[model samples]
Target: NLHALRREQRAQGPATIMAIGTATPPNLYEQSTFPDFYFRVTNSDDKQELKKKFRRMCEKTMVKKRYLHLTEEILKERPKLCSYKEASFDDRQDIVVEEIPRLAKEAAEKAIKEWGRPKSEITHLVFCSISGIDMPGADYRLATLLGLPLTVNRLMIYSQACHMGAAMLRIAKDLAENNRGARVLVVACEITVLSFRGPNEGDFEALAFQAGFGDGAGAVVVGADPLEGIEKPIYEIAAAMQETVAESQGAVGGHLRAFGWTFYFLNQLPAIIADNLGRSLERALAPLGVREWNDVFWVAHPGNWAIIDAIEAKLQLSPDKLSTARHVFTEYGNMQSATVYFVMDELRKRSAVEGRSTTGDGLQWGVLLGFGPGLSIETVVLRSMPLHH
Candidate 1:
């Protein structure tokens, strides 16, 4: 009887993504004006050569603009943040503690509304962020702000960059599929305020990061057994895997110090990813009988042009296949962990805009890849739902 009960309790089908939403701070900065504005605000006018280098880096990013939480007013109020050498950990933490949950609330509200369920019905909360660094963390603060029931199960993911969205969703899939009537709300919010620092000589990596990452939040509701005409399934979590490249640990990562966060990406990082991605995908997709790369729609992370380009070249995918990633990269820069959700939301919008047959641009299958600090790559095989009309 116990075994039968257990079998009956499991969801009949795979967990489905019911809704997705994204939010960015209102402060918009165009790429063209950024070099001057960045140098000016950080009070680094004396470093003209570095400023020029920064400009060139920004130009190559393919990012036309980005929305950031950090503005001149905040910088002026916290002057020590304008220098690379200053140690202002508490001051940096002070800002994100308040803003992270608030930004997360903005994104979660949209997803909750789209899910069309009372906020109290959200049985689980999965909050992930790289910038959140508080004792109780952003999870508790967000729960209170959203008015999720006190009994709502909570999970907090921290210090996980780039691959965090896929990672968190993987966890949600487990929760939704194993527990009957479960609704998991997954949120990933990030702010560059923690890592922003003045330009220093020989720190091109920091400049690259400044050129790449932006402030944003993304949220999604995951569940199984959708109610007809009321609940909708956008994509089914067909399969998910988290794979790490060997011996590539130091190639990409960050360290938190008294001076705030510092990140690194070895020049060989792109080549390393390009070399290993095909094999990784084979391991992730072969079991599903995915024979060709072009056969599946893509929803990979938009870390930068290079990472996306390398995936395209290595897989020999068609030019249009990764355009959604490119579009998000152009509009929002990389929001780190929050980027994959943006890609997911954009793919759905693109599918609708072009009047495709399904959410995956009329394709039946799709793949979501996320690359992060451990040289970690997360692959999720998705089955797009047919357009309900």
Candidate 2:
């Protein structure tokens, strides 16, 4: 019956994931660089006590480094984020308007290149961003900058913070299924030119984010048909879901104050996710009859080391299940909505190098998980198809 169900679902023209790609800001700052940099820019630069506290934040992070736009590297020739609180309002807005789309375009083009068609052939665009905003919004400009067709349908999932990647996959799956034969480009980008900050007194509360969040873009092209001569693994979407802890709404969010854009948190988010992980996973898996964690591999967002650790301590996840997520976060830090894309790509690379056949090896069933401000948790169940015919 399970096999029969698969055949029936296959006949329905399930959406095929043709390709995925990523792009990062021009600079790669070493985690080692963070200590000196924080000391140089903030009051911590002068105070020993503050210095110890902030350095502890970096030391415990386990994030080796990150790709960022709001660094001393880019801002050296311009106004820096170190003192952004005073001029950050207008300064950060202008940077987002100019740079977010540019970075996103690079990632979109990289992903669509595997579609083996012109940019104009991209039938739809799904864009997500939490770092900035616009009226007609970044979606319009993203389509144009990437040379996507003017008639292309667009969806913008804005200000959802880290979870929008999973959101994009859900919406893209819908577009691919309904618009039959459509090539949908899903791009997740974040420009932290504003949120990247130096140490402040209470900044310790939200400090982990400022210390770890990075600016980057991640994308995937979803469609009904697999590309010709495609050798790399092609993936497919089975089911996608999002759940929220209503009691925890507004537990994580940003605010505007006299100095500049401000970020706040009710408490450590790791413990929160741990409290809700089983419930969230069950809600996401019940429809698919997924009762055991071993049956599915995972691509959980590594918002920070603690979040990943919490899942393991609470659920006791296998290292094999969490390898890619830990790998992505350790190397790139929390890349906001773009983080999970990198996780998936990392899984792709690892599977390829090991000569693991997709459909041949029964393919790896996987769950992609992401979290955000509303205490919303979303996931997608998918797997690489070793062969697509």
Candidate 3:
């Protein structure tokens, strides 16, 4: 039923992203303060050695702070990091079902406004999420709440977490190009409540999850038609490519038990990404004519400082090239699926207020990257063209 809208046989042109928007919770916790709060809540005093390790991990996050759906006021009033785990699976699901849509709606509304299009004009809706699940899905809730037409084609994909931004953009690119004049809205939302864990004795896994998780939503507007009268160059979405390390499939993910949700992460997760990330990116880059790290802007997902360091050492990317990703990560921690769009938003904002990149004059190339389940590495290339070539 979905392909019924495909245009006659022809090459599908690139889908140009028109604008980007994001939403985040108000409870910002300073990264420095995280250890005290997290440790206090978890009562890490039980396992002094493990607590030491967890404290170091939280300190090295490179993130100055992170926002979570839980209000700081409420968190201060109670010590229920484990209490959350005690909640039934259905209880956690109930929380997700209630919050995901509204946060996603806020992001979509802001992005659509920037594009100056009627919500109903969007022909395709592509949503990516792993932080929550719902019957009838967030896509349906969004369409109805935002006034988007009921007929809009929708595709919902997830469990990839960080990797889904590029995945969703890849799909949105196809949707816009295949249906000439089609407008596709791609949105990503994640809230870490269910997947997070408090300090449990000798539980390094929960420590890993709790140390670097956050909540937020982001959106981007995509279309095949170039906006008329825009003096700047048009940004084009390229095909996304990815590589999955089969052995690393157990690296990062979650599952629900009768008690609640628990997270899993392999000890070698960052190493796996470092080893395979370059090859995967090169696959996406070769087609786009990227010759060097300087040739394109890097829209990196901010997983953590250690994860970033591994990428730099393996790929040899200059600090300047990775600035956007680093800056966003430092300020926002990891917003799961929503982080990359925030990078895109920052790039657009900087471009508007400042002139072309001081690093590379007249430059207009970008690479979007993220890591997730399968320890998969995903990449997307974007090229820009000034009006008339």
Candidate with the larger lDDT of 1 and 2: 1
1-389, model 2: which lDDT tens digit per residue?
97766455442466777778899988877886687776675535566787777678887888887887765645554454556356656667778878888999888888887656677778889999875578778998888888777889898877777888888888888887765457788999988876765666755765777678887899898886554565243677877878888788767777755345566776567899878878877866677786677777777888878889888778777677777889988889988899999988888777767676663133467778888778888878886577433
lDDT, each prediction: 0.89, 0.76, 0.73
* TM-scores, each model vs. reference: 0.98, 0.89, 0.88
Top candidate on lDDT is: 1
Residue 132, model 1: lDDT of 68
Candidate 1 lDDT, 1-389, residue by residue in tens: 99999988887778999999899999999999999999999888877877888899999999998999998999999988887868888889889898999999999999999888898778999999887678787999999999999999999998888889888878998999998888999999999888988887867888888889898999999998887788899999988888888888998998989888899988877788878888778887787788788999999887889988888988899988899999999999999889889999999998998889999999998989888887898888899988866
* lDDT score, candidate 3: 0.73
The 10-residue segment of model 2 with minimum total lDDT is 224-233
Q: Is candidate 2 or candidate 3 better by lDDT?
A: 2
Sorted by lDDT (best first), the order is: 1, 2, 3
lDDT of 3 by residue, 1-389 (tens): 34554345323557788878899987787877777776566555455676677668877676777888865444445435345457555655666777787789999999888787677778889988774667788777777778888889987775566888877877777778767668888899888766655665546677766777778889888887565664122367766776787776687876767655677876667787888766777777776667876667777786767777777777787786667778888888788889988887776666545666421224677777877876777777877554321
The runs of at least 3 residues in candidate 1 whose Cα sits more than 4 Å from the true structure, single-residue gaps closed, are none
Clashing pairs in 3: none
The per-residue C-alpha lDDT of model 2 at residue 202 equals 51
